[PDB]
Amino acid sequence: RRWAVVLVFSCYSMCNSFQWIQYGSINNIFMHFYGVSAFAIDWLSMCYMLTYIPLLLPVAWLLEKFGLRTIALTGSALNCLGAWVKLGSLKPHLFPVTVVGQLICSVAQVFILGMPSRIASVWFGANEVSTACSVAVFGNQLGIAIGFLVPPVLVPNIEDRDELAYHISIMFYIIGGVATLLLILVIIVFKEKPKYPSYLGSIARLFKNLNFVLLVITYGLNAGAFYALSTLLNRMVIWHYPGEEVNAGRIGLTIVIAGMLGAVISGIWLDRSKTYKETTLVVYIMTLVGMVVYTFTLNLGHLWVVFITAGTMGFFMTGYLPLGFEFAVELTYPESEGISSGLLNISAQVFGIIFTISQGQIIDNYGTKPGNIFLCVFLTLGAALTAFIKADLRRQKANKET
Ligand SMILES: C[N+](C)(C)CCO
């Protein structure tokens, strides 16, 4: 049963991430439908990031007080309710219903990203703890990819509002059915199971570690760049490539899939050899190089040089993500991995909000190129900061005991 739980959690986190990116994947179509500017539809993606921060601590308290069964049940139930609430928005003048459904979905997310560590800890031993967490993360990333690919094929950019409403209805039905099925699966399979047998202080100890602070800032930069790029991919891509929404979705799918492949490669490299600082430095440098190449080859007229560049940049830009968590645990082994992962995630959300809003404004007022140079400048600053990191690998030193 232990793997049924993982395969259900991965699937419904996938559904939640699809619900995150379904709007930014067809940003322009939704703009036309609801009649709102790009900024308003841009906020249906920053709702997740904004809601993640304040609700993280209550989520941890609820987990520690009630157990994993009820947390997973609540996450799936909120995901289903948020998915089905949006069905009241199938009209040009009901954007508030959508931005309420997305809020309910975002509240569900907070019960997702922190679970996989505990799921692996409670359902798996040492020989299988890593694989469960990796599978959950890959499920979430595949959710992002599917949300990038499916909407533009299920929602053609037709001028008529009624036919567009019908297509959006089809998409929301296909997501609500999945959410309901996965909620049933969570109620059935996600049986409660106990193990066989401070936070302020721990956070103070961590922040006393300047290396962890530098890692937090660098991970925030990278993850926020990824989130802003994912949210704004439709806006920039369609500007230079009119009437290519499906190809924008395919570009997003390529970015995310190359990201999963790079994450696998980086995980294997770290497991085989223990070089963390060098791996992170090279990953960040290659992410910066890919970002500059993507920025300065996007406006060339051929997706021949856009698919390849987006894939080869997203490869590293997303392989850095699990690597950041691993480096954080290595730097701060004595403290719980949950707190470090939570702080890295919070930094990611904050920098993602900042990057998304700033780059959206820059695209609106200055063009795509100034926004991409803004992102590239921030990414190179992050790369320099990471290169200025001293690797006091506590996990390796501690495990070297005997
Ligand atoms: C994009 N994710 C769903 C992975 C996190 C956003 O808060």
Swiss-Prot record:
Q: In which tissues is it expressed?
A: Expressed in non-hematopoietic tissues, with relative abundant expression in brain, placenta, lung, liver and kidney. Also expressed in hematopoietic tissues (fetal liver, spleen, lymph node, thymus, leukocytes and bone marrow). Found in acidophil cells of the pituitary that secrete growth hormone and prolactin (at protein level).
GO BP annotations of the record are: choline transport; heme export; transport across blood-brain barrier
Compartment(s) of residence: Cell membrane; Mitochondrion membrane; Endoplasmic reticulum membrane
Taken from the record's topology, the Extracellular segments are 20-37, 88-94, 155-159, 241-244, 299-301, 366-367
Endoplasmic reticulum recorded as keyword? yes
What spans does the record annotate as topological domain Cytoplasmic, numbered to this chain? 66-67, 124-128, 274-275, 332-339
Q: Report residues binding choline.
A: 16, 20, 109, 113, 227, 349
TM segment ranges = 1-19, 38-65, 68-87, 95-123, 129-154, 160-189, 210-240, 245-273, 276-298, 302-331, 340-365, 368-390
The annotated consequence of residue 227 to A reads: Slightly reduced transport of choline and ethanolamine
Q: What is the effect of changing residue 194 to S?
A: In PVHH; uncertain significance; reduced choline transport
- One GO molecular function term? heme binding
Instruction: Look up and give the membrane topology term.
Output: Multi-pass membrane protein
Q: Which UniProt keywords apply?
A: Cell membrane, Disease variant, Endoplasmic reticulum, Membrane, Mitochondrion, Phosphoprotein, Repeat, Transmembrane, Transmembrane helix, Transport
* Oligomeric form and interacting partners: Interacts with components of electron transfer chain complexes III, IV and V including CYC1, NDUFA4, COX4I1, ATP5PD and ATP5F1C; these interactions occur in the absence of heme and are disrupted upon heme binding. Interacts with ATP2A2; this interaction occurs in the absence of heme and promotes ATP2A2 proteasomal degradation; the complex is dissociated upon heme binding. Interacts with HMOX1; this interaction is potentiated in the presence of heme.
Similarity-based family = Belongs to the major facilitator superfamily. Feline leukemia virus subgroup C receptor (TC 2.A.1.28.1) family.
> What name appears for this protein in its UniProt entry?
Choline/ethanolamine transporter FLVCR2
Organism of origin is Homo sapiens (Human)
Q: What is the lineage of its organism?
A: Eukaryota, Metazoa, Chordata, Craniata, Vertebrata
Q: Which gene encodes it?
A: FLVCR2
Q: Which residues of the full protein are shown?
A: 83 to 500 of 526
